[PDB]
Design a protein around this ligand. Structure first.
Ligand SMILES: Nc1ncnc2c1ncn2[C@@H]1O[C@H](COP(=O)(O)OP(=O)(O)OP(=O)(O)O)[C@@H](O)[C@H]1O
Ligand SMILES: [Mg+2]
Lengths: 23, 164, 388, 96, 62, 98
């Protein structure tokens, strides 16, 4: 959940895993 | 994954926090009363090929014929193949069935998803099974043990340290 | 009894590798194999026969005993060019053994080996086998298939789509035109395949494709594609089937239906029973009785049992919660008799060994498969754990 | 013709050319509100019905038939002879 | 602005703070369950040519 | 035959030949909703029933028998003579037509 001055309004979202995976 | 048997009851009320179940036969309750206590787990259907684990937190029985009510809280989801995920998004619509968790399922869950096993005793309903908590994170940090007189605290601490 | 399936496959992959690195205006023709029994003897009587063996570090006569030997029975029985495929480290060359090598091998010390050679007839033009037979040293299946798909990506395709829908399809067309009983032109035009394979949209489950190495990863993609469709309680699904090619059909059709309706048509929230249609001259009544024996009822849309009424065939059933009672669970008919269409269109249509149907349309999803055993389709629909 | 008129019937067949007693004699589904019914009558031919029911009938009506196998001492048999069907409606209280 | 399609339900109560919506069919809810969770947004009408955005705070099924 | 027709009877016997008055003149169980009745009629032969009841019968219908031992000044007694059973149906209002 993103909240603050940056977003137009408070929102919820789902990530997608990055490539390459960090390790 | 396995066959679950006959259902004990159907859903009557739902919400993202609370789920309510109702039984209407005395014989079934008397048949399964050993596994319908507080702390135990039930399986609820939310659509084709998906299940929802819930924890019992309240039982009631009233005659004026018999009504039996059970209340639960969602914990997570379990698919057909066996994958388990915390986080309950879905809501099970009424008219759905409720089944009693067979022990093999829990045995598997504990087998596959715990990194550093550490046996802390036996399960309640079945003594044969073993309860494997994560040993790496228990000792790394603090612990607390509390109990009243005559309950077996010192023997418990003794057992923990002995296996340690 | 041998049938040398994997060798029979090796030169199909050779053929597609030949078509692989080919310029425009190049043509190649395949020739079938004698395992097919056709008196017509179509194909210019240019059949080919092969066998495949591995795990030999350096070439010797002793390592390669049985293969060449076992060929000769065929000669004794009756342009059938025998050939052999194998790959061994440090051996990259094609050879033809001359006379003294044949006379060398003729005698065999292994006794049970010659026990059947006794089956050989005396009248043998010895050198014909030699000049006709040829030995080939080419790469083993593993790297050849690896490079096959690694380069098939070169043209430009989706990286994953090729595994489950394309590579199994081409080998199928190849071996089809190889052993098809009725005649047609073997000649193949390279560029037109690119036109056909692009538009073709189907998945093939057959005897040859399983032996392919990539098989085992084509199952799971299809299993994971249908999961979003089959996680709904109320949907309208249709089936069409053609029972000629399927094997052991009369004994396995029933179990399939029972397993499907047990999981997908057995409760109060399931309000739209499925429809099954068959093409051909099949007799339904027997199936209807055999299912009644199991405890299920059907809607056939026949008031007087001469012809069909559409409106009754697409009606909704009665339901009761406590205790559960279901008026009917499934729908049955023959496609020829059904004239017209439903008031509401299918959400999902399944076609098993059917080329086309009149109900296709843009909104509908149209899954297609080519099957030889029905046990394969259950795993796709999540009614069993392990494949064959 | 009865289907066009509006009614639904039970005949007893399970797809073939033979009749089954248990399917012919069975209870229908009912819904009190709104009223729904599965079937309203059960129709057949005599020759095909080979056997007898579990529970004997309370009333057996015969119109121009002499005797039937389902006659018994503990069963009420009403037997008539008529020349037109309009006569029977009067007997059964469907007209004045 | 663009066509929104068919609606889920109608209003049954209102106030400056709270708004309550009512659905009556199981098929529709099962169809749109992916979009009716907490933290997501809905559009409600007011007169002609004006819409109101709302955020969900509770759900109940009986 | 009555059982086949769907009715239950009280005969007043416990294994043996003899008959018991206290077990033949007893009250039945009744459940109001849903309606159930333990039994609907009594049966016996006259000679086997030797004795009497504590509460005397209100009405003692006698069909073709002259005298009995249960007749009394304070009991209502109706004696008839008939040739076929159907007449009693009319007498007692089961079927109107004669
Ligand atoms: N696992 C057990 N199950 C049953 N009985 C036990 C068990 N362990 C110990 N006992 C018996 O019961 C007692 C358990 O409680 P114990 O006195 O050991 O701890 P405690 O009651 O916490 O001591 P205190 O309360 O005096 O600090 C023991 O004295 C022993 O006699
Ligand atoms: Mg202590």
């Amino acid at each position: 959940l993103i909240v603050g001055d940056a977003p137009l309004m408070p929102t919820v979202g789902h990530f997608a895993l990055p490539v390459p995976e960090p390790h | 994954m396995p066959d679950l048997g006959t259902p004990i009851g159907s859903v009557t009320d739902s919400s993202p926090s609370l789920i309510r179940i109702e039984i209407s036969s005395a014989e079934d309750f008397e048949k399964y009363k050993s596994m319908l206590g507080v702390g135990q787990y039930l399986l609820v259907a939310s659509g084709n090929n998906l299940y929802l684990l819930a924890s019992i937190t309240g039982v009631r029985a009233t005659h004026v014929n018999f009504r039996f009510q059970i209340d639960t809280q969602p914990i997570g989801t379990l698919s057909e193949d066996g994958e388990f995920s915390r986080g309950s998004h879905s809501l099970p619509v009424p008219t759905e069935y409720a089944y009693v968790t067979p022990p093999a399922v829990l045995e598997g869950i504990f087998s596959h998803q715990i990194k550093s096993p550490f046996a802390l005793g036996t399960l309640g309903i079945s003594p044969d099974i073993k309860l494997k908590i994560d040993g790496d994170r228990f000792f790394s940090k603090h612990v607390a043990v509390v109990g009243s007189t005559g309950s077996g605290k010192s023997c418990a601490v003794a057992k923990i340290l002995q296996t340690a | 009894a041998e049938y040398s399936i994997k060798g029979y496959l090796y030169q199909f992959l050779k053929y597609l590798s030949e078509i692989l690195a080919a310029g425009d205006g190049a043509r190649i023709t395949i020739e079938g194999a004698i395992e097919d029994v056709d008196v017509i003897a179509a194909g210019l009587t240019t059949a080919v026969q092969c066998k495949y063996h591995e795990q030999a570090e350096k070439y010797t006569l002793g390592k390669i005993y049985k293969p060449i030997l076992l060929m000769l029975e065929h000669f004794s029985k009756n342009h059938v060019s025998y050939r052999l495929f194998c790959h061994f480290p440090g051996e990259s060359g094609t050879k033809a053994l001359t006379k003294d090598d044949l006379e060398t091998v003729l005698s065999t010390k292994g006794e049970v080996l010659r026990a059947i050679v006794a089956r050989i007839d005396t009248s043998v033009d010895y050198e014909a086998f030699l000049d006709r037979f040829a030995i080939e040293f080419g790469p083993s299946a593993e790297d050849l298939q690896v490079a096959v798909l690694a380069s098939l990506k070169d043209k430009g395709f989706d990286p994953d789509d090729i595994d489950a829908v394309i590579f199994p399809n081409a080998i199928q067309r190849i071996v089809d035109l190889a052993t098809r009983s009725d005649v047609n032109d073997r000649t193949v035009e390279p560029k037109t395949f690119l036109a056909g394979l692009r538009e073709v949209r189907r998945v093939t489950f057959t005897r040859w494709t399983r032996e392919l190495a990539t098989k085992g990863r084509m199952f799971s993609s299809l299993r994971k594609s249908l999961r979003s469709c089959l996680a709904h309680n109320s949907r309208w699904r249709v089936f069409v089937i053609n029972p000629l090619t399927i094997e052991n059909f009369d004994d396995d059709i029933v179990r399939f239906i029972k397993a499907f309706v047990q999981r997908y048509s057995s409760k109060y929230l399931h309000s739209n029973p499925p429809l099954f249609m068959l093409t051909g001259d099949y007799d339904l009544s027997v199936l209807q009785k055999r299912l009644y024996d199991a405890g299920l009822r059907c809607e056939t849309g026949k008031v007087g049992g001469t012809d069909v009424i559409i409106k009754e065939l697409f009606r909704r059933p009665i339901l009761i919660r406590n205790p559960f009672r279901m008026e009917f669970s499934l729908r049955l008919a023959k496609r020829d008799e059904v004239i017209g269409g439903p008031q509401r269109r299918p959400d999902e249509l399944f076609l098993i060994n059917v080329a086309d149907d009149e109900w296709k349309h843009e909104d509908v999803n149209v899954h297609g498969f080519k099957i030889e055993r029905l046990s394969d389709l259950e795993y796709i629909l999540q009614l069993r754990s392990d494949y064959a």
